[PDB]
Design an enzyme around this catalytic site. Sequence first.
Site, PDB file in Angstrom:
ATOM      1  N   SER A  52     -58.919  10.173 -23.024  1.00  0.00           N
ATOM      2  CA  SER A  52     -59.493  11.221 -23.861  1.00  0.00           C
ATOM      3  C   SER A  52     -60.856  11.684 -23.361  1.00  0.00           C
ATOM      4  O   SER A  52     -61.243  12.828 -23.624  1.00  0.00           O
ATOM      5  CB  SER A  52     -59.602  10.735 -25.307  1.00  0.00           C
ATOM      6  OG  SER A  52     -60.378   9.552 -25.392  1.00  0.00           O
TER       7      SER A  52
ATOM      8  N   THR B 155     -60.599   6.207 -24.546  1.00  0.00           N
ATOM      9  CA  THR B 155     -60.395   5.613 -23.232  1.00  0.00           C
ATOM     10  C   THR B 155     -60.882   6.553 -22.133  1.00  0.00           C
ATOM     11  O   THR B 155     -60.622   7.755 -22.174  1.00  0.00           O
ATOM     12  CB  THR B 155     -58.911   5.267 -22.993  1.00  0.00           C
ATOM     13  OG1 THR B 155     -58.464   4.353 -24.002  1.00  0.00           O
ATOM     14  CG2 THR B 155     -58.716   4.631 -21.625  1.00  0.00           C
ATOM     15  N   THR B 156     -61.595   6.000 -21.155  1.00  0.00           N
ATOM     16  CA  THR B 156     -62.087   6.769 -20.018  1.00  0.00           C
ATOM     17  C   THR B 156     -61.919   5.939 -18.755  1.00  0.00           C
ATOM     18  O   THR B 156     -62.511   4.863 -18.637  1.00  0.00           O
ATOM     19  CB  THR B 156     -63.555   7.165 -20.208  1.00  0.00           C
ATOM     20  OG1 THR B 156     -63.683   8.003 -21.362  1.00  0.00           O
ATOM     21  CG2 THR B 156     -64.065   7.912 -18.990  1.00  0.00           C
TER      22      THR B 156
END
Lengths: 202, 202, 202, 202, 202, 202, 202, 202, 202, 202
Positions: free
Chosen positions: G129, G1-2
């Site tokens: 992350s 996930t960003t």
Amino acid sequence: TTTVGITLKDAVIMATERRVTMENFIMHKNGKKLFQIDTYTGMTIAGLVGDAQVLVRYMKAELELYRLQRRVNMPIEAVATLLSNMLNQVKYMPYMVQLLVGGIDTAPHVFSIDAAGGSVEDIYASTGSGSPFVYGVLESQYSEKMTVDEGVDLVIRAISAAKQRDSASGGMIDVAVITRKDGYVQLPTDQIESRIRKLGLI
Amino acid sequence: TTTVGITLKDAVIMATERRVTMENFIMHKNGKKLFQIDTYTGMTIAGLVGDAQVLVRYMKAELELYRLQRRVNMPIEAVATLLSNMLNQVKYMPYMVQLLVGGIDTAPHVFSIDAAGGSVEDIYASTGSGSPFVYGVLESQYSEKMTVDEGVDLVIRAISAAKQRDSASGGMIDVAVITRKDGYVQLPTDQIESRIRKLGLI
Amino acid sequence: TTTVGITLKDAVIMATERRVTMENFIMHKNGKKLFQIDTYTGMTIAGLVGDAQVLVRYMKAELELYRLQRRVNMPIEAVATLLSNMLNQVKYMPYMVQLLVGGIDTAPHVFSIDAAGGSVEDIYASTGSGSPFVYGVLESQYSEKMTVDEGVDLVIRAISAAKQRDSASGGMIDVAVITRKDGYVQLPTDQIESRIRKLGLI
Amino acid sequence: TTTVGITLKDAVIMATERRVTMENFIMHKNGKKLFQIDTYTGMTIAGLVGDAQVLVRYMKAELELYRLQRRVNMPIEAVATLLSNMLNQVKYMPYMVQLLVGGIDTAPHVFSIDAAGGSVEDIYASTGSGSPFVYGVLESQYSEKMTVDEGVDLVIRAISAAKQRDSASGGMIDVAVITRKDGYVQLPTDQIESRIRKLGLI
Amino acid sequence: TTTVGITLKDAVIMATERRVTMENFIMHKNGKKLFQIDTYTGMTIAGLVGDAQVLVRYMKAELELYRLQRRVNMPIEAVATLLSNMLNQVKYMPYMVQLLVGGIDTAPHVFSIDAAGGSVEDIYASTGSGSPFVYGVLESQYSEKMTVDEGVDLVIRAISAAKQRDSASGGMIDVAVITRKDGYVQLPTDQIESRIRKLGLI
Amino acid sequence: TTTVGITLKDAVIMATERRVTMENFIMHKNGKKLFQIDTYTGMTIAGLVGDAQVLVRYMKAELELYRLQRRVNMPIEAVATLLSNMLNQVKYMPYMVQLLVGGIDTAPHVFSIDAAGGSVEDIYASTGSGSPFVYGVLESQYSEKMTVDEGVDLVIRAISAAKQRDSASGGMIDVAVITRKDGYVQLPTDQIESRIRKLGLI
Amino acid sequence: TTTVGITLKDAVIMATERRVTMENFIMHKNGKKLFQIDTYTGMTIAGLVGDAQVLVRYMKAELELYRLQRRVNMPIEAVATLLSNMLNQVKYMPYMVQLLVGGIDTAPHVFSIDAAGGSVEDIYASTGSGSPFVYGVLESQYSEKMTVDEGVDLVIRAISAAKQRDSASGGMIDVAVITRKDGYVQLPTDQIESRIRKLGLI
Amino acid sequence: TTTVGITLKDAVIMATERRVTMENFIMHKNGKKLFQIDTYTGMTIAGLVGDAQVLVRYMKAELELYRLQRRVNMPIEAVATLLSNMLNQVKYMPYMVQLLVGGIDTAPHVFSIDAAGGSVEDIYASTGSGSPFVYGVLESQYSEKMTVDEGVDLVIRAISAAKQRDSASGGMIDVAVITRKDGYVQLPTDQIESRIRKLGLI
Amino acid sequence: TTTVGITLKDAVIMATERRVTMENFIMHKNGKKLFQIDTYTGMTIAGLVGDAQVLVRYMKAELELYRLQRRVNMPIEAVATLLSNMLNQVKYMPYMVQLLVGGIDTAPHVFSIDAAGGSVEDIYASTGSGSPFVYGVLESQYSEKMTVDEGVDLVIRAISAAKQRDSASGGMIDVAVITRKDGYVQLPTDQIESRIRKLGLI
Amino acid sequence: TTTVGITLKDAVIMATERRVTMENFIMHKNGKKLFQIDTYTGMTIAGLVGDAQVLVRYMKAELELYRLQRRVNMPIEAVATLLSNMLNQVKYMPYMVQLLVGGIDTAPHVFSIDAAGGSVEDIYASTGSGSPFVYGVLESQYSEKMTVDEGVDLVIRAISAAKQRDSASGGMIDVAVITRKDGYVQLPTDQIESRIRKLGLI
């Protein structure tokens, strides 16, 4: 800690020592472990001091209220049964104590009560870390025909032996004699010292 | 932490040091560990600071309310019994403290109370990490015939010895004297310094 | 266990008690904890009895062989260094002991050695569970100007205080005096009893 | 424990305190933590006393043998590299020590060595539980243009601050000055006391 | 995190840095750690950000309601006592914070409060991972006779030293000055930068 | 720790920062993490300082002996393979390090080696706690057509970004350029400072 | 996930990717992580999908009810404070999420909120992350003078870099622009693809 | 298990019971726990049967070889020292036994040896789970002026008391008498039964 | 503990021993384990004394109230079902007991109940640590055609065998016989002793 | 598993069952657990099958070699001693077996050997999970005056009872009779079946 209670023909004799081990050293030399909880009833305590002292206060209140309401003293076996219920009701968060209850209602009685509420009547019993040394003396020397004076000397010798071998026990010996004629009588300290000198234990 | 309380013929002397170890270093050099909780009663604290300070506030409130309702000061043994019940009721989620209670009602008294609610009266007692060093001094030098001035010098020497060997203890020594004639009197700092210089402890 | 060693102008005084706690009770009342390991050297032991007794035999053999080969007694600091190496070489499977070494080579010396081989020289030292009580007495009463007779009384009082507060300590006190003029001299038991009666410790 | 080492234009200054904490109390007040290991080299120790003392003996032997064989003193960086190899070879069964090495070969040097054999050169460094307090003083007051006299006052103030806040540190301060002209010189105790009085730290 | 609070003759000075370490990296460079909670009261926070921010909102509400009801500002010691009760009531599910409270009611006060509710008044105090470096600077340089301008320079130097040695601290320094005459005044950022340039800390 | 190595048409550029975190604080600001191990070979280290320094000494010895015996420099891939075997042979008692090896034999090469002996060649790589921030800069800005001057600016910007977000990284940036024509050349500190000022990173 | 959110002069830009990792593989390629929760407010989610989706529904309900009752949109800082209280109230049974809140009330704002309820305002922030890779791009390339078009290209490049190095991130990039003049506007997918082709990221 | 050994003017008396508890029940009623290991030496065993039986065989071999080589019986203290070394050499993989050694070389001796090799001489000793009951009898009834016949009755009573209170003890009592004039003499079973009937223990 | 219950043509026979093991030794030799709970119903107890005694009191109260309300004795299977429900309702905080219930309603019945509330009817059953020895005797010797006198001899032999092999069992044997004609009859102690002498079990 | 061995006037009788429980079910119904290891010696095995079978092969080899070298059969007690040494030498990595050894050298003997090497001679013994049921039968029915035929019936009844109550035991019963006149004789299966039918055990 060393406590002992014996039965005779018409008497009950209970005795303890006085050493209290708080924070892993001998902090108190004159603790109190023998209590009168009724007119003809006594109790000794071993284990956690805080739990034991709370139970002593509870028993004094219950027995005094019982005497005022029903006009007679609670029977000794009834005292043990009441303690048995109280300890068993909290068995999973228990009082970490060992108890002896002795007295006269129509005959001498001594009861041993554990932390889980188990109560067993016996002719004599001993609690605390010094108890196995006491049982050795009682097994070889106790007699059911002993007089009160002989019984007092017996418990003094038994506790004296325990003090020689158990580091958690020590101090002056307190002795109480319970009879129907004289009630609960705690022997004076000077009389105990005189018996110790006569027995050659000092 | 080092606290001490002794009894004399007509007086009670209590004394502490001031070092507080918060976050594993010496964060405070002038902490307060000796408190007046009644007209003729004092208390010392050792252990967790937060728990101890809450108990001090509770005892001040209870004793003041007791005095206003029953018109007399609470007896010293009654103070210890009240603390004993409070600590034992939460024994499994306890206050991590060691307490000394001393005062005058009709005679000097000093009580030692542990985290589980066990309360034992003694002629003298000491709490904290520096207590074993104090007991060594008291065992060899304490006398029941000492005067108040001699008793003050005794507790100063005992705490000074503890500060030399216990890293958790340090700072200025606070001393209080309790008598029926003069009540709770905390000795001035300059007087303590004068006694230290006279005893050759600096 | 309580051991102590002090230094004076031209003398070394070492003293121990005799109680041995095997299987969690007082099994032996007259154990030996003070040993002569050379002409002018003594050693006290605290901790595991088996480990301590083996080390005493090793030191006697090493010092006697050293004396025969190099024709002179091993210096006291060299004795401590040899013990330091022996203990540190097995630090992860160590001897669970606390050791004091004292003697005269050209001046009095007392060394304290821990289980990991750390050796520190000091004017006085004490080992065992009763050591903190001894340090309290020594901090308040030790003087470097004391005579040998005053020093003997000092160690007797210090150990007596420890026996009053440490349940692991007890029994008769053994005292040894080391001087260049008289060598290693263990004081007779009757002389120790006479000093105890004169000091009012019984 | 508090150790410090600083570099100047043509000098190295190292200083320690003396408190030793054996068995969780202050057993020794005059321990030795600063050692001369070569003609122009010194070393300070922090951590386990037994491990540190063994390493000091090893370094003295290695450096003396090195000087006799190669006819010159070992360079300071070579001393640190030798220690780095020794500690790293036993990293999984390590010496639990923190080390500082300082000296003069052609220029001042100070090296910090950890238990795993990591060696880093720095202008100044400090080890022990009192080190963070020293770094605060050095960050705000250290100057590379300081004279030897100013440097000695700086390390005394830094260690004095650490003793006020770290309970594991205490006792008299030992200071050594290393120069090419004068070699390894340990300052006398009276001179240190004079500087303490002049700085107002007592 | 590095927070500091000091007392002067008629002023209180509090200062913090701004670095916030969320998810094990430097996520925020301009966090807020110094808050005004009353007319003459300030507070600094260290520890868990969520717990600290909730407590700040609680204290602002309690103090404002207190001022409106009793028509006067809450005394500083009363503020600390209120926080002490709140933290101790949840000691087993506690706020993981370290708090400093400072202000003027009739004289300067600074209080240090831990997660368990222990509150200690002191002339100066510091919290956070950078606190030991601050204590080193304060021990060697703090003076009770300092002016306000000198006190501001002192806290700036102390925090600057902490930022050089504590990786968890960094960013711009925020400084507040509390006086009876001027109230709670937060110094402008440009003034702080001017003092930093004058002190040679950049 | 932040290390980086990149490849260009006929050059290899390696760069590190200098911060060393020993005992959980910033003890050293000028550590060395970039080393020349052969005529046209360099290496960066991250992880345990003791393990890394030992490996650097081993590689210098192996490569110098290799050059003297076989009369030519060891190929870069052979250097990585030798390190791969050494680390894998002790994988269950491993060196806790992260390594980068770069150099010129017939073309630029950069190798990344982990603690278990895995070796992977790549156009660029980064190690340490600050590596993910470097990879972000390199992903968006690296070009294979860059000149040496542009490459030096790239690594400076990447490390500068890491220092802004990784608390374990800091200090002056060291940069080395490896070419066949000029060999291993470490850029002077003043030149690095000039590039930092030109890039607006201070 | 960003996820990423940045502030400009009069705009807020938020962007996420779409990869969802359920049961340790890539089960969903087009998840939704960017939500409009008010007229001028948006929110991104990272962490446990179930917890995040529940919080999004709660915030939409709270903000819509707030708008209907008080006739105005909730201020952005008030939105963050409400979330801070909700998360902190269940800190010991928490939502395992990382949140970003951005919007316009009178000026651009972006808030970062952790699982424990800590809320910090910042000029830009990133969660998930892949966040450290984004911070590297933003540190080297973000400018406060950027236009909206330049800001959109910046977040696209930052997320694209994260997708190249974080295996937990991937899929199409969703971008939203918030302004007072135009409100919450989610950019069309074709426009995002056009910018990606123009930037050479495919 | 219950074993006992006592010393008199010119005799040593040792006695054991016979119960063996294998697999948590009474599998054997007539086990052997008292052994003759030399002309004037005996030994009792308690603990693990396998370890104890191996040690008995070792001691018989060592003592017989010693007698044949040096032409005289091994002294009793030398026997204890040999056992002490053997047990301590394997202290971390030890024999789980408790041992008593008694005999005559020039005077009566009784030694108690634990699993770690600690050896202590005493006038009387007891091992096994029934030992505390024996110590109670011996403390109250043992006399150094007793005859051999009185000593035999004493050990019989002590073991009989232990059998009444220790479930791990039982069976017939075996008694051995060691004198210089008569050597090692094991009393016949019928004689033991006669003494039991005369003492009223059945 | 050893309890046994058997069924015959028109009778139920139950028997127990009396040994109580409190604190890991034989503290009581005359405990009570066989109880009459109704006119024609008996119960034996094994396990924790406190739990068992509470259950006995509960069953006496329930059965007496049942008899007074419904005018008839509760059927034996109904007694077992009531106990089954009581134990199962607290299975995760259970009574640590083993129970046997036997009696006559229209035919002999014996029920075995475990701590989890499982109840199984059987012709004979045995509980306690000595039960497997009893089952061996019953398997080889029990007959459904036995008379009451033969059945009494059978249970005496079975318990006597258990006492010879189970250290937790001992003391006098108590036997009760339940018939419709004679009700619950506990055999006198002298009659039991006469049968033991006739069977040759003493 | 159930094994048994008994002694008579001039005979030894050993018997086992045949059930083998491999992988938690009954995999084999006709396992072999009784072996002849010498001319007049037999052995039974219980526990781990692999360990037991290896020991049987070892004993056959040792005893046959012993007979060939010393021309006589090994005495039964010597056989037990040899097994005792073998098992004790590997006590910390032991054979998980229970063994019985019986035979005739000059008189009948039966030995019981545990996994730790403890060997005890007894008139009869039983091993395995079914042993307590066998001991019940033997305690009530074994007689030393029994004939061989009566002894065979006794062991058959004892094992039959064990099979009725131990789920790990079952299958056909194997019986061997050892006498000086006839040697080791294994009874035929048909004879065992005839005795079972005559005893009414099927």
